[PDB]
Structures are given as structure tokens and as C-alpha cells.
Ligand binder design. Structure first.
Ligand SMILES: Nc1ncnc2c1ncn2[C@@H]1O[C@H](COP(=O)(O)OP(=O)(O)O)[C@@H](O)[C@H]1O
Ligand SMILES: Nc1ncnc2c1ncn2[C@@H]1O[C@H](COP(=O)(O)OP(=O)(O)O)[C@@H](O)[C@H]1O
Ligand SMILES: Nc1ncnc2c1ncn2[C@@H]1O[C@H](COP(=O)(O)OP(=O)(O)O)[C@@H](O)[C@H]1O
Ligand SMILES: Nc1ncnc2c1ncn2[C@@H]1O[C@H](COP(=O)(O)OP(=O)(O)O)[C@@H](O)[C@H]1O
Ligand SMILES: Nc1ncnc2c1ncn2[C@@H]1O[C@H](COP(=O)(O)OP(=O)(O)O)[C@@H](O)[C@H]1O
Ligand SMILES: Nc1ncnc2c1ncn2[C@@H]1O[C@H](COP(=O)(O)OP(=O)(O)O)[C@@H](O)[C@H]1O
Lengths: 152, 152, 152, 152, 152, 152
């Protein structure tokens, strides 16, 4: 689609505690995507329950929210062509037992409840998650010096 | 299912000769598995033949045994949930021709007779290999400081 | 001194454009320091002139401010024992021509006007830079799961 | 099947511009393949048109040749068993959207027109591409010290 | 001066706990030194007190032995020309505050009591430490395939 | 001073044999220097003797020449401000015993007769070595997409 597509990527509290902030950012950075927003944050419980509002009936919802509250979160917005779908491919399968080596979860995660990172699963959910986690002023506008070498 | 499942991972003499001990250990270390036993050994021929007992009448058996005798072996025991199956996924296909990049054999190996590493193919074979290569006191009991961040 | 000492580290616009956000964060992360605040920001010219207010009489001041405005900045606050002095050691000499390999500038920078990163040179300047760049609510409070293994 | 098979790998101008010469070479070097020829060249227009002669009727042909002329190319010849097929697997799918993480394009590329690298798709085309890009005297004959550890 | 010199390198419990076994081994492996013995052990109290016998009058002696007992240790014997002196340089200064980036402690450690690794400080002390931590049968004799390329 | 200063960097046969082409290129590539010429060559004895002409009556001259003939050499020309002096700093001390970790020889070499790489010691010697190893048309003229972010 368009090279200005954006997605929401968040390093979960287990990824921060295990020192994976650098490696995870390098995966998207080396792929050619543009970081337009990033901040370390500890959101309230109500925001995390809204982020996972589609899973409010799951049995693991209560444990998921409390685990997302157990530490800081590195919330990011990455911009690039097909960055939503490609971003999920970089993260790996939701259950890292089903993820392939070379992906984030395939290299670092074991339990589905401790899968290190989060990524938007659709363009519409990406826009809803970006507006939920970031203010419009936190989206930084700039052009990469190698844009014409990453994109045709 | 059980987070205390154990598998036997061994760096074959070609992996030792090519300076791959560090990177191979980092594959399991960065994934979140616990190293409970490790030693550099040059095991006798009988132990290696007992290790590959199910392949005694294979055409490549004699060559496999002498090649496993041609250099030191880094024998390891890794502990973690589904470490047996996931460990095999980390190693890649037995023939690195069929292995995917991002795995150990997919990044370092070419020939099936020089596939760099070994991994237990099942839980029962893992217990038999662990008892064959390691004495019980050589398995170290300890608790990882990030156990609760790797497992839910 | 105290293990709660904080310093201000910022990835300059040249470091962001060249894709060094991941590697730089990994230097402090692998050393054992705790990231307590981080955000991607494009500060106004007045804030950057206050950040370098001690150099308002330098001939390179006008070019320094405009260069700091040419792209986004990854502003960070790292916490750890002697993190101010050790942080400068990790960055390297101000002129990367005088920096040693293994440091950030020793591995990535050439020109002093394009030295990729910034670091506070004293505890007092660190407190002034932290309050200048970050709001008090952006400092996230948490304890690393390996704190007792990094510190005695 | 034979260990003396050769393929032509070429780092495209976008790969050179984005500082990927080192990492791409390490992918084949760490796998066990032998570098027998390499040079940084800026070939004439007629050479690139012959390289993609089978795509002369494609609508993107003129733009492909023009973009391949816009910068230097790191032309290489790698030798090893099944190096053509395995080399293609290391590069990843032609469209980086379909490429897997762990491959070259899966880690570094996004656009099909900016897939940073090229590899021969067959042994016949490899010989034709090697004869087109290299003089026979530029292929260096040597024996790797770890040959007997890579191959059985 | 002789290439058969041996030193004792030991990854301390904090190094094991922080997932640094792989990276530390790669430091010596990539330099050209040969691993002739390695094991993951949890030594008794009397062995650690003999290891630091020269520091029995230090005030931090009791705490040092207790902390060295609090987790597993990766005991290693590396062989190479001037491996004792060069090994100390690779580890870095005893106090990580004085260590340089690029060394093990300069990249991973902060506290003197948590410097993640140990190395023999002399050839005489290396022989004493090797005889204390390893049985003679645990030192594997082999010839590196790149020996004639590491040494003249 | 001049950003178009050029130096001659060559990977010696031991560096090629030990699979160090990728990492060595990344040292100069990540620092921000521009690769303008590169080729894998097996130069004749006379060229190598002319390269080390100032050492003709040294005791190690004959051994140095035959060792430089024993394998392929990756000859390169790198361009950048103070690339000659900084390039030598990246390589480390001639005797890797005296070299610091973080440099090429400090991370990969042990013996002075096997110090992996070569670098021009002065600007005038660089011009003489570049003309000795490379034809003028083999030097590629191009502009890095991040030139204005590496240099002020
Ligand atoms: N069975 C489970 N047990 C515990 N946690 C789970 C389970 N399934 C999903 N989760 C957690 O809930 C989050 C939401 O998962 P979901 O949105 O369905 O997939 P994804 O987050 O990969 O798009 C996941 O990131 C995962 O950490
Ligand atoms: N056709 C073959 N030729 C040579 N060696 C082989 C062949 N098949 C298997 N081997 C070697 O024998 C070992 C045992 O193979 P097997 O146990 O069947 O696969 P895995 O090691 O993946 O469990 C392999 O690691 C491989 O190195
Ligand atoms: N001579 C110079 N020319 C251009 N820019 C300079 C020069 N000296 C310093 N700078 C820039 O001004 C910034 C402030 O430098 P200074 O505060 O003196 O050292 P540091 O920032 O390393 O503590 C530096 O980060 C550098 O990028
Ligand atoms: N639809 C397209 N649009 C733009 N460029 C393309 C397209 N398809 C292929 N190319 C370019 O043409 C080159 C030749 O493609 P092809 O030979 O079919 O794939 P491969 O290079 O993987 O063998 C590719 O490397 C790619 O950069
Ligand atoms: N002042 C101190 N406080 C706490 N621990 C110390 C102190 N000095 C040394 N140690 C510990 O004792 C060990 C032995 O120190 P020493 O042998 O003098 O240095 P090295 O281990 O570099 O040879 C060190 O590894 C260090 O962990
Ligand atoms: N004493 C020695 N013994 C063996 N080889 C040596 C010795 N001194 C130098 N050499 C080799 O000769 C080459 C030329 O040395 P020299 O030019 O003086 O240092 P540099 O290569 O750092 O400029 C070195 O790269 C080294 O490999």
C-alpha cells in the first residue's frame, strides 16, 4: 500500500526487564521502517483494559492486564509500507512455541503470557492503538536520509 | 507444559572447531532457557555408539562415530518449557540444506554429516541421553533471576 | 556513589538518521544501567539553546543548534551507580577522532559536529538537563529483576 | 551435490548505500561458503541489460537498469555445495513482503525494487552471470582451513 | 611466549544469572584462544576460600565467598600465547568503573563485587587455579584447524 | 581535515581464512567511511615485496612475503576525514599483544606475524599503496546518502 502506513509496537514489561529494548528496536530499524513516536510509559489499568478490550471475556484477561502493569512499557509507532503486517511477521507468532527463529519471539520468548512485545494486527486497530497510547503531538514528522534507497 | 523439562544439546566437533560455541550457547541463552549442566568432553567410542544406538546399521554409522571422536564436544543440558521440541527448532533441520535461516544449522551448516550440533528428539530420549552423558551431580540446581519474566 | 544516580543521554539527529537507536540503547542496557525515561522528541530552538547555554559564545554554536533541529532526538534518562561518568566513557571523547574503538563515537562517529550522541558531564548538569528535557511524570519508577546481581 | 558449485551474489546499490556490505558478506561467510571472487564495480549499461536480459519485456526493466546504475555494486562469487539454491534461501523471497525474518531481505529490505541484493537462480544462470561480471583471472583458487569441518 | 600457555577463566554467578555465558565465551573464542576445559559447577565453600586464599584478610572476603556460592559458575581453561595477560586485558580492570568499553567488564559490569568474571593474574596462579578447579582428565587435548593461521 | 582522504586497508590471508571479512568491513562501514574500491586478489610476490619495501632487510621479511602469498587478500580503499590515522586506530597495535579490545587485532588477533589486517601508516604511503594495488578505474566515484549526517 502506502509507505506512510503506521503501526503500534510496544515492548511489554517482560521485554524491558530482560534487557531487550535495544535488540527489538534494531529489528525494525534495520528493516528500513521509520520510528515516528516512542516513549517509556507505565499506563493506568483502565488504558490497558481498553487496549485489550476485545479480549475482556478471555480467561487470561485478568492475568494479562496485571502483567502489563508489572513494569514499564516502551510504546512505539513505526511507519513504513505494509508495516502492520510485516511488523507482525518480525514479532513472530503470538505463542512463541509456534514462532520461528529469526523473529523477536522466536529468539527471546517462550510463554504466550510472556511474549515480550505487542503489535497491531490491522491498520484500523493500529490507528485506534496509536490514538489510545500517543498524543498527536508525540508523532514526530521527518524523512529518512535513505528513504529513496529503501523505497522505489 | 512443564517448565522443568530438560533436553540434551551437544556441540559437535565441527561446531567446536569452527568457533561456534559462543553463538550457539547464546541461541538458547537469549531464548530464555536455563543451563543446568555443561562440560567439554572427548567421550569414548562406546558412549558415542550408545548415543546413536538406533543408527547402528546405518551406512553412515561408522563415519558418524569417528567424526564425533575427531574433536571435543560441548555437552549441555538445557531446561525449559517444551525445550526439547523448541530446541530442535532452534537447531534447524537435520540436513542444513532443508534448514531455514535464523536457525543454528540455517546460519552455520551445509552438510548433514557436519551439522554442527545435536539435540534430543523426544523427552524420553532426552532423559536417556542426559543420564548417558552426565552424572547426576553434574546437573546444577539453581533459579534464574528472571524466571518470573520468562514464564507466566 | 549511590546506585540511584541519573544522567541524561540523547541520541542526536545524526544518530537517528543513521539507524543507531538500537545499538546505542544496547550499550547502556548491556552495561547494567536502568532506563527510567525515554521519548522521541523534536524540541524547539529555545530549548536547545538553553541546553547548550554554556556554549553561547562558541563560534560553532549557531551551527550546533540548527543541526540539533534538523531531525528527531531520542532523549533518555539512565539510572545507575556513577552513570554520569561511566556514561561519558561509553560515549567516548567529544571529538570522535580522539575516541577509542569500543565506544559509541569510537564505533560510529567521525566529525565532532556529528558525534551521534550527547551525555551529561556532571551530576549537577544531569539534574538540570533532566528537568529541562523531561517532565517529572515521565520518569518511570521500577526495579530491575537483576538489580542484586548488578550491584553489591 | 558437489562442493565446487559457484553462484553469483551481488549487493545492489541500495545495499551498499545503506551500509550492508559487511552484514551480507557475513551471512555467506558464517554459513561455510567460500569467497572466490569479489570486487566493487560500477558496470556499464550494456552489462546490466544483459544481466536482466530475460526481463527485457518487463515494464520495470528500464527502471531496474537505471537504478542498478545509480550506485556501486559489490559483485561476488561464492563457492559451496548447493550454493545457488541455499544462496537464494539466504537472500529471501524476491518481494521482501514475502521474505522471512532471518534472511537478508527479511532483515533489511521492504520494496521489491530495493531488495538490496541479487543471487543466481540456477547453476546454468550462475555460470552465465559469473562469466558476465568477472574475468576468469579474478576468481581466486584457495582451500579453506575448515573445509574438512564444513564438508564430509 | 609459548602458545601452550593456559589460564583459568571463570564466569561468576552474576555473569551466569545475567545471560552472559555466550558473549563471554565468544570474546576468547573470536580472539583465537583455544578452549581446552569447561564445566558448569557449584563448588564447595572450601574450594572458593582456597581460590581467594590471598584475600582471606580482606574485609570483603566472607562476602565474596558467600556470593560466589550463591549461583552456578562456568569454569573454563583457555590456551594460547600470553593468554594470562591478554585474558586479563579482555576482562578489563577489576573495578568496572576503571574498565574500558570493549572489555567484558567495560561492556557488562558496574560493581567491583559484581564483575561477572574472573581470570588468573599470572602463569603461576593459573596453574594453581587450574589444578584446584579441574581434574587433569577434564582438560581436552586437541588441535585447532586454524592454528597455523593464528600463530606464526 | 579533508573528508576525501583515502587509505589502503587489506585483509591478510589469515583474516580471510578465519572468516573475518564481514566483521572487518563492518568496522569501517559502521564508523562512517566510504568504500571506494575493493577486490579479492592473490597478488604476485614482487608486488608484495614492493608493498613492504621498507622492510626488505628485516629478519621476518621472507616469512612475511610467503605468508602474504599463502592465501587470498581482500584489498580495499576507504575514504573519509583522517581515515588513515583513524583506520590504524581501528586496526589496533601492530602486535595484537599490545592492542586494546574493541579494535580489530584486539578482538581477533594474537601474533604479530598473524595480525589479520593491514593499514596505511601515512597519507603519502596510502597514495603509493593505492596506486600499487589498484588501477585508477577500479576506484569507484559515488556519494553516500548519509554524507551530510556523517560530516558537518
Ligand atoms: N492463552 C493465553 N494465556 C496467557 N496469555 C495470553 C494467552 N493468549 C494470549 N495471551 C496474551 O494476550 C495478548 C493478546 O493476544 P492476541 O491479541 O490474541 O494476539 P497478538 O497480541 O499476538 O495480536 C498476547 O500478546 C498474549 O501475551
Ligand atoms: N545421510 C547421512 N549422511 C551422513 N550423516 C548423517 C546422515 N543422516 C544423519 N547423519 C548424522 O547422524 C546424526 C543423527 O541423525 P538423526 O538423529 O536421525 O537426526 P537428528 O540428529 O536431527 O536427531 C545427525 O546429527 C547427522 O549428523
Ligand atoms: N569545534 C566544534 N565544531 C563543531 N561542533 C562542536 C565543536 N565542539 C563541540 N561541538 C558540538 O557541541 C557539543 C557540545 O560539546 P561539549 O559540551 O563541549 O562536549 P560534550 O558535549 O562531549 O560534553 C558536542 O556534542 C559537539 O557535537
Ligand atoms: N514488480 C516489480 N517491480 C519492480 N522491480 C522488480 C519487480 N519484480 C522484480 N523486480 C526487480 O528485478 C530483479 C529481478 O527479479 P527476478 O530475477 O524475477 O527475482 P530474483 O532477483 O529474486 O531472481 C529483482 O531483483 C527486483 O529487484
Ligand atoms: N573492594 C572490594 N569490594 C568488594 N569486592 C571486591 C573488592 N575488591 C575485590 N573484590 C572482589 O574480589 C575478587 C578478587 O579481586 P582481585 O583478585 O584483587 O582482582 P582480580 O579478580 O581482577 O584479580 C574480585 O573479582 C572482586 O570481585
Ligand atoms: N617482529 C615481527 N615478526 C613477524 N612479523 C612481523 C614483525 N613485525 C612486523 N611484522 C609483520 O610485518 C607487517 C609490517 O609491519 P609494519 O608495517 O612495521 O607495521 P604496520 O603493519 O602496523 O604498519 C606487519 O603487519 C606484521 O604482520
Amino acid at each position: 500500500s502506502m509507505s506512510n502506513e503506521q503501526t503500534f509496537i510496544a515492548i511489554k514489561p517482560d521485554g524491558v526487564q530482560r534487557g531487550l529494548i535495544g535488540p527489538i528496536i534494531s529489528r525494525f530499524e534495520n528493516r528500513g521502517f521509520k520510528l515516528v513516536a516512542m516513549k517509556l510509559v507505565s499506563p493506568p489499568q483502565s488504558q490497558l483494559e481498553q487496549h485489550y478490550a476485545d479480549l475482556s471475556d478471555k480467561p487470561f484477561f485478568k492475568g494479562l492486564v496485571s502483567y502489563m502493569l508489572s513494569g514499564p512499557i516502551c510504546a512505539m509507532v513505526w511507519e513504513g509500507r505494509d508495516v502492520v503486517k510485516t511488523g507482525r511477521t518480525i514479532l513472530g507468532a503470538t505463542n512463541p512455541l509456534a514462532s520461528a527463529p529469526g523473529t523477536i519471539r522466536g529468539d527471546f520468548a517462550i510463554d504466550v503470557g510472556r511474549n515480550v512485545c505487542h503489535g497491531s494486527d490491522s491498520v484500523e486497530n493500529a490507528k485506534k492503538e496509536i490514538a489510545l497510547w500517543f498524543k498527536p503531538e508525540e508523532l514526530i514528522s521527518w524523512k529518512s536520509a535513505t528513504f529513496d534507497w529503501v523505497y522505489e
